[PDB]
Amino acid sequence: DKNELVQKAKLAEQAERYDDMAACMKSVTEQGAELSNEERNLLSVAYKNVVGARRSSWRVVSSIEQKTEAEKKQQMAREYREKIETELRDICNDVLSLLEKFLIPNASQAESKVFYLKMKGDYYRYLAEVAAGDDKKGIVDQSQQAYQEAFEISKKEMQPTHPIRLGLALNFSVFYYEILNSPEKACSLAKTAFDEAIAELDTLSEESYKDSTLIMQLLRDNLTLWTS
């Protein structure tokens, strides 16, 4: 039963057992019906925590390795980095295939489609950070493609102030800056998202004033930081 599984995911969230919480939402997703947004929210919360723990661990260990003057201490760090990466690849491949088989093809509203497209760009981007030299360009493209598709839909079906459209423009501009290394492209994307949203603050709901404006601030923060 779905309701049983969601109740379980919710318990797991209260307890901060994100691995448990992810397994539940995995199953709920796999039942094959379109997820409510409460479920889409739980799925996302759980994978964000599970993958983010590895992604933070990978950073600590990877920056100890490449800050090493002792060949045996460094073979250790290399072995640990890669054990952590394989954990990370598993989690991303899980998500990516959940996105490929259920979430994107069942998404019947634009807002939903754009969110899952963004998620696929964001999960490929994570795989690109950790990719050998050989596979990287191909993975980078998968990431770029999902974001572009999300971007083309959002431009066409959503208000420039929709938090999901903003968030997409935030993550895509970062992808251009940090992953594709095109600061010129990162900047215009973020400038124009910001401007189009200022130009239409009429289209802001009493409900989401705070959330939209906050994201617009983070977009600006990157502008100023990427400008200097």
Binding site: N41, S44, V45, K48, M119, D122, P163, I164, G167, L170, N171, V174, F175, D211, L214, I215, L218
Partner: peptide
């Protein structure tokens, strides 16, 4: 937060 967190924004 809540609606910002599951939006999974870029670091």
């Amino acid at each position: 937060q809540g609606x910002x967190d599951x939006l999974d924004l870029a670091x």
